[PDB]
């Protein structure tokens, strides 16, 4: 499909950045046009175009939404299942394995967050040549810098980007430990559960499902919903 320099430069940028929020990619899209001065397609139409010359690479600019507050993000994501590699290439064997171990914990974690300290204990486990906690604390900051990991209060969760990239991989690899939202039915790393079911749903899902409802009731089992209903995302 018809590619322009504006499109390639967009891709170059979108990649050096791991991932971008909606407005930043329109701030982006427009930038590329102004740097290449014509009319600027609805970012949505712009993308679909590109996504379409990408088919033969079996990769796509994918839109996703965050697990903490439902911001729209976009990453360049593989349609190919075994996406262990975008990082596999980026980091050391021992670094990769540290991620695995960390991810492994993020999942089992009720919260979808893991403590730094719980992670670092796994440092002697690491494959691919000895590292120490000091070195390890940096690497964790690396994953944060690169939008695979997110931190709050010395704890770590997967970054939206991570999920967009590796959802496939993850599910296929950790089927008995993965959690899925009702509603979305997609992988879910953090969210609210029901006390009566064990049902779970992404915050933004809980936001939308119970939006404008004075009596939020658990969809499966219909028991009253114990948690604070978030207010669905909007530009402000």
């Amino acid at each position: 499909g018809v590619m322009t320099d504006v499109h390639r430069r967009f891709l170059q940028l979108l990649m050096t950045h791991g991932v971008l929020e909606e407005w930043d990619v329109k701030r982006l899209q427009t930038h590329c046009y102004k740097v290449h001065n014509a009319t600027v397609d609805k970012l949505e139409d712009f993308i679909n175009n590109i996504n379409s010359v990408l088919e033969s690479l079996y990769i796509e600019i994918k839109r996703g939404v965050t697990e903490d507050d439902g911001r729209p993000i976009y990453a360049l994501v593989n349609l190919a299942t075994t996406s262990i590699s975008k990082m596999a290439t980026d980091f050391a064997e021992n670094e990769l394995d540290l991620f695995r171990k960390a991810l492994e914990l993020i999942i089992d974690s009720e919260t979808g967050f893991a403590s730094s300290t719980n992670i670092l204990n796994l440092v002697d486990q690491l494959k691919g040549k000895k590292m120490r906690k000091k070195e390890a604390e940096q690497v964790l900051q690396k994953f944060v810098q690169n939008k695979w990991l997110i931190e709050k209060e010395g704890e770590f969760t997967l970054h939206g980007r991570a999920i967009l990239e590796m959802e496939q991989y993850i599910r296929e690899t950790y089927p008995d430990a993965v959690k899925i939202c009702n509603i979305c039915h997609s992988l879910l790393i953090q969210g609210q559960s029901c006390e009566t079911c064990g049902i779970r749903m992404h915050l933004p899902c809980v936001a939308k499902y119970f939006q404008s409802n004075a009596e939020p009731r658990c969809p499966h089992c219909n028991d009253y919903w114990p948690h604070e209903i978030p207010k669905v995302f909007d530009p402000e």
């Binding site: 590619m3 390639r8 690479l57 190919a80």
Partner: protein, 189 residues
Amino acid sequence: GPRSQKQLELKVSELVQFLLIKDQKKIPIKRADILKHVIGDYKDIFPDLFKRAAERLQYVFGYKLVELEPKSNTYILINTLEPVEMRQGTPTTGLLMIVLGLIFMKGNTLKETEAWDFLRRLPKKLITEDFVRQRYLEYRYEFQWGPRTNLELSKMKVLKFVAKVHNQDPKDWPAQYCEALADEENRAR
């Protein structure tokens, strides 16, 4: 064995990913490393395969895959475009930027000396005294931005800048940031 259209398209895709990822590191990339970590058993049809990588690499992302030295057996990525928060720019402007930067960061106001010892480090006295004629406001030797600048830059831009130095900008910003955005909005009207 039997490889369908997609089996192959997948392979070239894999390769263009490999290249893309490496070039960030400005490695440069070794044909053998390429061969170990991507081709595997598809070696027999590689050159044609490479050719494809090369073109897609160029056509979709506008990168020229080039051997750097003839008979290097090693390749690199060259940007065909095009090419390229405050901008062959002046030397001093960087300095200023840093300074107007410092000032934004510690609550929009900062004492003199503290920066100075810390600055030479990285015409000091005289250039920053005259910085005042224009970009600066100084009392006694406390510092504030001074009128000239806000016409020429923003709290956000200064942020983008300080950001780019370490890179990022969520973390040193959030505190400051929020006003910087309250300034972006402030700028509309």
